[PDB]
């Protein structure tokens, strides 16, 4: 997030980090319950990857994080790779997350929910803070 | 391929089409043997997808094509999603292709092979012929 | 790429107003946010865009795409969860 | 999106000459081709870029990325198979 700030450690409990077996953080994600993760379908997640939960500082070693294994990648069939439309995939965890003070689910809206333009919202992540 | 031509049917036997369970062609690929396919890692192929071989006209019904099921997606660990560098994934077929007059393997080069600038080469596919 | 988690507040835009920046790339299952001095960037994809509805944070968008430079004057594009939640519910229910 | 398979002949460029178009985006495991009047485009990714070496077509590149408009004056970017074949060989051998 270019021009963002550092977050309060543990303040966004649903935020996860998708890392390949090399340890490289390539995408983010959101926990919707102890067994399901939501991320972008374009992330190209495979079952060989890992979901990291309860992480704040990717460079710390004393963090009691949760390295979670992916059972199945559920790419939304409407997903259009040429347009990047309907960019969503569900990740079914083989090993369910352990909810705590730093690990929990974000709520999902009604198909009918309204989010008016002008509403200030929040986005999080470990993306580049500078290009 | 913008500004290309139609190919001779069956002339590029290794070319495959990756289609989701909706039937939507989203990426291309190349057969390196009866059990392995090479495509871009950014295509975000899952095991729920299908590899189509021996296809020429995606709209024809009388084509004796080969709908192949994916056993495992092997995303190159060097793959860097932020830079799109090392953009390669191997697809291990659960059901091996049947080589014929329209289905075969492309050769792979030596790590030491040289391909000088100026060399005219050929690229194929079902990508947009116009943006 | 920062070691620790970043956060940023940002306004949602209307698709129409967003189309002024992106044209016909902006589809119905997409929602725009940003062009406010901040910007999502490479490595943020799959991440959350949340709004507090009735005291609880609710997933409104999924960090999708945007400016290749991550320009803070250009609105980022996120997957519109509102138009995708039915697929989610159906998928959770059957697996 | 055409129903039937398209083909196109195109020249390979040097990375350095390619960097004039793309700058520091062009990495070592990437090889450029095009800017010749033709252009790979959306849906071509994962596809092959081949050169005939000794009478046989050999996989030199994998359709990766390029101009968002698919400009025929802008060189397309393909995955450099030469710098990736060792990974391939190792992976085939162990599975």
């Amino acid at each position: 997030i270019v021009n963002g700030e550092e977050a309060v450690p543990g303040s966004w409990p649903w935020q996860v980090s998708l890392q390949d077996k090399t340890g490289f953080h390539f995408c983010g994600g959101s926990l919707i319950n102890e067994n399901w993760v939501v991320t972008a379908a374009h992330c190209g997640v495979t079952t060989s990857d890992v979901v990291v939960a309860g992480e704040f500082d990717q460079g710390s070693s004393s963090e009691k994080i949760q390295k979670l294994k992916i059972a199945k990648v559920f790419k939304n069939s409407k997903y259009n790779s040429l347009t990047i439309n309907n960019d969503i995939t569900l990740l079914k965890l083989s090993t369910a997350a352990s909810f705590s003070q730093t690990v929990s689910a974000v709520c999902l809206p009604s198909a009918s929910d309204d989010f008016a333009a002008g509403t200030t919202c929040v986005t999080t992540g470990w993306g580049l803070t500078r290009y | 391929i913008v500004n290309g031509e139609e190919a001779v049917p069956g002339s590029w036997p290794w070319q495959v089409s990756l289609q989701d369970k909706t039937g939507f062609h989203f990426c291309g690929g190349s057969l390196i043997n009866e059990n392995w396919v090479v495509t871009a890692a950014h295509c975000g192929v899952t095991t729920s997808d299908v590899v189509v071989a021996g296809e020429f006209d995606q709209g024809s019904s009388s084509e004796k094509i080969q709908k192949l099921k994916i056993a495992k997606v092997f995303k190159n660990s060097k793959y860097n999603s932020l830079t799109i560098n090392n953009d390669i994934t191997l697809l291990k077929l659960s059901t091996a292709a049947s080589f014929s007059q329209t289905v075969s393997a492309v050769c792979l080069p030596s790590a030491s092979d040289d391909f000088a600038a100026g060399t005219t080469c050929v690229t194929t596919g079902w990508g947009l012929t116009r943006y | 790429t920062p070691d620790r988690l970043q956060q940023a507040s940002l306004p949602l835009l209307s698709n129409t107003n967003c189309k002024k920046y992106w044209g016909t790339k902006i589809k119905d299952a997409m929602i725009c946010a940003g062009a406010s001095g901040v910007s999502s960037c490479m490595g943020d994809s799959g991440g959350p865009l949340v709004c507090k509805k009735n005291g609880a944070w609710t997933l409104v968008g999924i960090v999708s795409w945007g400016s290749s430079t991550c320009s803070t004057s250009t609105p980022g594009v996120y997957a519109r969860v509102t138009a995708l939640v039915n697929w989610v519910q159906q998928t959770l229910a059957a697996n | 999106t055409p129903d039937r398979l398209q083909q196109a002949s195109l020249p390979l460029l040097s990375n350095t000459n390619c960097k004039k178009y793309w700058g520091t985006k062009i990495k070592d495991a990437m090889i450029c081709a095009g800017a010749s009047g033709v252009s790979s485009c959306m849906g071509d990714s994962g596809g092959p870029l081949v050169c005939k070496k000794n009478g046989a077509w050999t996989l030199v590149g994998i359709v990766s990325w390029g101009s968002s408009t698919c400009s025929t004056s802008t060189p397309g970017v393909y995955a450099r198979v030469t710098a990736l074949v060792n990974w391939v060989q190792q992976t085939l051998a162990a599975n």
Binding site: - | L82, I84 | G43, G66, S68, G76 | -
Partner: peptide, 4 residues
């Protein structure tokens, strides 16, 4: 890229 272009995509995040």
């Amino acid at each position: 890229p272009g995509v995040y």
